[PDB]
């Protein structure tokens, strides 16, 4: 099997890739919901306490607790970028002031954002794979269409044409020669 | 290239930036006094100023591993973003609190492409 | 299916063409025999004797067709090289002229058949290669991506759940 | 590809004479070598055909298409089936007393498989 095989695999693969893409979109939406919910809870606390969280957070930045470690990994010929988060324990957390009871709400939001960011590091690692995978699907479906909707018809013509040339030659011999 | 790249850089609005900074990704390079995040404001931040920061995190700095950017902001400079193709930094377009979800108009594949900087 | 029948027909039409080639060529050969017999001249000898450089050559060319690259042949006819001037045929000379005309057109037809077989051979190799890529991808990168994305969604579901604890 | 410009022939008396008339024949002036080999049904040995086939297919870089009578190729079907390179393109054609069988044709088999 060749075309009949390719055709089947091509299609099986395009469904698998449609699902992946859908699940990545689903993940992307949840990211949005998760992050805004967290943001809304900081607003709540900021409003309630009068403190400006965004100010305090941003002005206390110095050195990164949350870093990554970046690798290039050869996988069946294609080079992929992978990331692993690493968390420096030498660096302390933020100690936000003037929140009182609201401090625990912020603590929990921080817990959430950290886990969300880790999730982004994993999506980022997923990126090169999906990009390659995208182009493979596109190319593969280009070939299958060429064969089906171009190369075959074009060959059906060529062979029809060739037979007409030979019919005319046969005809011209019946007459010009004998 | 790879072993030097350990930071996550951000180009994003007030709320998004605050959340990420809480997770602990922010850093000030002590020698250069540079930050690895740039807060954006609609109305005030110019397209030219975004392009500077994008270029800066992407090509001028050797230590950024992943660049997070609000999709809306990246849409302002889509030309520049699409043209960037290097393996590092990995570029991730994400939502804001003002724009949690994607337009229902957009296909899944388009949404996912934009996510990965296309 | 529809495509496999269209391809079966092509293979049939190629066989049909191949047979006509046989008939067309033997008929021409018969007419040279007729003349050789009638005139006493030995056409095969004279023809072969006057060969030096090829009048009828080909040029292999590469054609991009919807992404896939194909090799085609185009017949090239050197005008620097003259035709044969066979001697001692008299009236029979015109019969031989006409047969030469026919053989030339027949050969052009063979160049086209050669291009066609070459097309399918290349096309064969393209399919093989393409299915090799698809299997390579499917062996590792696909599964790995499917897991990572499943895992990522579970993390986010739990985070969503932990936020919605709000009562 | 660029070096391949000739049509080579391995064929009987009649077939060869016709093709030579069309103008495909050529003699390398220094080597005195030809791009055609006439075959005779009683006389030409299997070993001698294999030499010429190998010569036009692998020893020479300038042949683009090799024409061959199906009957002749049938004598060396083992060797012909095993040859798979795109160049020279190999074209089995009928001859007198030997009508063309589709299913013997090596290229046509390969193309039939995989449809």
Curated annotation (Swiss-Prot), chain A:
Record keywords: Hydrogen ion transport, Ion transport, Membrane, Transport, Vacuole
One GO BP: endosomal lumen acidification
Cellular localisation: Vacuole membrane
Membrane topology of the entry: Peripheral membrane protein
Chief site of localization: membrane
Disulfide bonds: none
Keyword Transmembrane: no
Regions crossing the membrane: none
Gene Ontology cellular component annotations, sorted alphabetically: fungal-type vacuole membrane; Golgi membrane; membrane raft; proton-transporting V-type ATPase complex; vacuolar proton-transporting V-type ATPase complex; vacuolar proton-transporting V-type ATPase, V1 domain
Any GO MF annotation of the entry: proton-transporting ATPase activity, rotational mechanism
The keyword Secreted appears for this protein: no
Top-rank taxon: Eukaryota
Annotated family: Belongs to the V-ATPase D subunit family.
Oligomer status and interactors: V-ATPase is a heteromultimeric enzyme composed of a peripheral catalytic V1 complex (components A to H) attached to an integral membrane V0 proton pore complex (components: a, c, c', c'', d, e, f and VOA1). Interacts with RAV1 and RAV2 components of the RAVE complex, which are essential for the stability and assembly of V-ATPase.
Miscellaneous field: Present with 8500 molecules/cell in log phase SD medium.
Annotated function: Subunit of the V1 complex of vacuolar(H+)-ATPase (V-ATPase), a multisubunit enzyme composed of a peripheral complex (V1) that hydrolyzes ATP and a membrane integral complex (V0) that translocates protons. V-ATPase is responsible for acidifying and maintaining the pH of intracellular compartments.
Protein name: V-type proton ATPase subunit D
Gene expressing this chain: VMA8
From-to range in the entire protein, with total length: 27 to 204 of 256
Curated annotation (Swiss-Prot), chain D:
Topology in the lipid bilayer: Peripheral membrane protein
Compartments, as annotated in UniProt: Vacuole membrane
GO MF: proton-transporting ATPase activity, rotational mechanism
GO biological process: endosomal lumen acidification; Golgi lumen acidification; proton transmembrane transport; vacuolar acidification
Keyword terms of this UniProt record: Hydrogen ion transport, Ion transport, Membrane, Transport, Vacuole
SUPFAM superfamilies: AtpF-like
Family indicated by similarity: Belongs to the V-ATPase F subunit family.
Further comment found in the protein's record: Present with 4050 molecules/cell in log phase SD medium.
PANTHER family: V-TYPE PROTON ATPASE SUBUNIT F, VACUOLAR ATP SYNTHASE SUBUNIT F
Protein name per UniProt: V-type proton ATPase subunit F
Provenance organism: Saccharomyces cerevisiae (strain ATCC 204508 / S288c)
Classification lineage: Eukaryota, Fungi, Dikarya, Ascomycota, Saccharomycotina
């Amino acid at each position: 099997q060749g075309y009949s095989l390719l055709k089947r695999k091509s299609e099986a693969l395009t469904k698998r890739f449609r699902d992946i893409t859908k699940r990545i979109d689903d993940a992307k939406q949840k990211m949005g919901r998760v992050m805004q919910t967290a943001a809304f809870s900081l607003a709540e606390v900021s409003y309630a306490t009068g403190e400006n969280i965004g100010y305090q957070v941003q002005e206390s930045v110095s050195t990164a607790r949350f870093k990554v470690r970046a690798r290039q990994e050869n996988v069946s010929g294609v080079y992929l970028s992978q990331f692993e988060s690493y968390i420096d324990p030498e660096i302390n957390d933020f100690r936000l002031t003037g929140l009182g009871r609201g401090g625990q709400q912020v603590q929990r939001a921080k817990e959430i954002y950290s886990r969300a960011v880790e999730t982004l590091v994993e999506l980022a690692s997923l990126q090169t794979a999906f990009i390659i995978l995208d182009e493979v699907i596109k190319v593969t479906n280009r070939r299958v269409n060429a064969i089906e909707h171009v190369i075959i018809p074009r060959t059906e013509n060529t062979i029809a044409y060739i037979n007409s040339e030979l019919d005319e030659l046969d005809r011209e011999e019946f007459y010009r020669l004998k | 290239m790879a072993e030097k790249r350990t930071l996550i850089a951000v180009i994003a609005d007030e709320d998004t930036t605050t959340g990420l900074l809480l997770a602990g990704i922010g850093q000030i390079t002590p020698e250069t006094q540079e930050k690895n995040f740039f807060v954006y404001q609609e109305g005030k931040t110019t397209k030219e100023e975004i392009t500077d920061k994008f270029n800066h995190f992407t090509e001028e700095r050797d230590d950024i591993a992943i660049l997070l950017i609000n999709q809306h902001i990246a849409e302002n400079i889509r030309a520049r973003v699409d043209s960037f193709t290097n393996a590092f930094p990995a570029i991730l377009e994400i939502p804001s609190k003002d724009h949690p979800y994607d337009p229902e108009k957009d296909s899944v594949l388009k949404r996912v492409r934009k996510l990965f900087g296309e």
